[PDB]
Amino acid sequence: XXXXXXXXXXXXXXXXXXXXXXXXXXXXXXXXXXXXXXXXXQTVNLLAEWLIQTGVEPVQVQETVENHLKSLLIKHFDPRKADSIFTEEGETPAWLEQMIAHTTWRDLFYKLAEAHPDCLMLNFTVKLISDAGYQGEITSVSTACQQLEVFSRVLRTSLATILDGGEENLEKNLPEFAKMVCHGEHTYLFAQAMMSVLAQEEQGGSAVRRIAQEVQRFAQEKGHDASQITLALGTAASYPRACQALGAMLSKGALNPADITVLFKMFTSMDPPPVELIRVPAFLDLFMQSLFKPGARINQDHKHKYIHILAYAASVVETWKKNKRVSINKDELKSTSKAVETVHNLCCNENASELVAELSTLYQCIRFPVVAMGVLKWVDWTVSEPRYFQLQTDHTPVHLALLDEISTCHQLLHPQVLQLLVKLFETEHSQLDVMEQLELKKTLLDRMVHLLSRGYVLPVVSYIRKCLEKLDTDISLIRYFVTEVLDVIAPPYTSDFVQLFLPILENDSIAGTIKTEGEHDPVTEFIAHCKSNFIMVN
């Protein structure tokens, strides 16, 4: 019997219960009965879409902007004092419908905001994201992964994403995967245990082992002592004292000679450990650090023990016929030992005319992969010393000819080789002449062309496009790269190489590529072949 409404009829619920049982002084009741002092603006907001029909954009962005304003209001007027109370009270028709329709970022930002209260709302929204078909895809939060049913499935879909990705996606997805599984070290334990059980199989478990090794490398970067977890997952703990020695040594992150005598007494006997205890890559990286730094002298007595340990790591084969070995061999680790000994002598002698002299023996050595990885780390630690480029022969291409040898005789080192070349190319060399810096960059681009020749092309051209577009280098260097690449290649052309090599050539310095070639035609041939491949160019 009030009859005092403008648009408070939409609030007809709580009004009605305050209408029949009003009593006492209903001043506040009547004031809230007519607190909707505007017109029918809940319908006129729907008429704003009809006005947008005359506007520039009658699309779904208007309802998206209204829902974004509603989400910003629900986060601004978030009921943080009674968040867990309102979570634990109703929760049946509201959170279920909201996760049915508007589960895009609302409850995700709500669980990103506080995440300690509202365990009923967090549990219902987590179970509804579990009811979502693709996953865990809404809960992409480094601190909302503290629930096991959530985190296991998020781990599953991220592993599926990486394992369908490949080596290209190995660089892009792995920090976005590793910030979750290194957030808590117990989550690291869960993830590495899953890596172990999946890498029990020889039918594609090598990529799982690889992803485990990059997660372990990221754990070593961020600050874990994750080597003890790594050895506790391994079979190496079945032979206790060797694994304990590795545990202390990889907890120190450095080589102790007494510790390697403890290892070496257990090796080269008639009962070796299973070779997967020594194949851990952080251990071989500490070997490269302690052995092939240009300083860091090794005291000539347990040196052959070091070389024999690296040779046994990178040499021997085995046949695990139902968890036992019956046929191993040691007949190439003498050549491996001789090669790594010759290379450590050449890195110990530190005399550069001798480095030019024994370069044929060094070319004989880099036929071996562990030798080539070690020479790559040594040339990294030598050439990247500041104020190095002051010996100048053809702007010092000697170590870069060793880069060409490493790139020639192997293929798996090519990411590290490209990483070294793009580390030197980004590095501005002070105290050099600017023409001299420019010819140093021309030499590094000659090395990148040599990497492009041996198959490893797409990250190189991707970097050249990245440094023409983003944060630009000198245009003459890219012109020289295009000039040297197009003086060696010939059709047929794979579509990815055309798709990646087209925009750097056609945009931004057409004219500089052709000056005086004549006998073999310039970029015009590549443009003609690019028109003949694609569907016009598109």
Next chain:
Amino acid sequence: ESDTGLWLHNKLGATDELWAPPSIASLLTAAVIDNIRLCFHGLSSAVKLKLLLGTLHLPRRTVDEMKGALMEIIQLASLDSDPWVLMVADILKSFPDTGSLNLELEEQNPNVQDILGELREKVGECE
């Protein structure tokens, strides 16, 4: 010592960090573990998880001294209704006994079953 549950919650209960903190082998002495064994159901799940992960960072001889008390803490940890404590107890039950962690995590858990089934299919098709 006295009030040792409060002592573990004081030295380990900074919930803003989630790794095993350093000097955890200097915080886990056999007398301290034998003080934990009677007040183990009182302290919080985060501190309990720090404790169970820190029991792996001990050296091998200290684990080999008093592995029975560590197994008792494991058996009390497997009874807790927390998901993390149950899973970490299921992993860590084989570490003081053998030296290696558990690899058979497959029973009593539909989570491990779903992840292993989907990932065995995925690994089988991604060679």
Next chain:
Amino acid sequence: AGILFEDIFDVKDIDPEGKKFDRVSRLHCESESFKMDLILDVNIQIYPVDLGDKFRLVIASTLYEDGTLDDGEYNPTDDRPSRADQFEYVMYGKVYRIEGDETSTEAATRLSAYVSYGGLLMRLQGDANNLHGFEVDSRVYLLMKKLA
């Protein structure tokens, strides 16, 4: 009675990045119970501290057990009973900085008080419930005492 802070620490490191000064070294110490770090400059000559030691450390606003709040003048003839007779290494200095893990929205949890004893620096990083007695630009004492 005038004590701002009291805890037993345990020496973990003595000046681990090398010894910058021969007569004074810094001690990286952890607490026995409260989970707090203390970095302390001490004179090794008149008061040698070895690694693995355990000591009590009591910041007091004054030495006089009644809390009479002296100005800070050197009175070697005052026979009022002070608390320094319980201890064996008393350093007087001013607390110059209280930084902490704080946010512009919520309060600080982990505080870090800085105090210079003449020139001998001490950082005490603990929780805010234990470092609440500290105030910036006030005068404190140190009162450490080693014990087996």
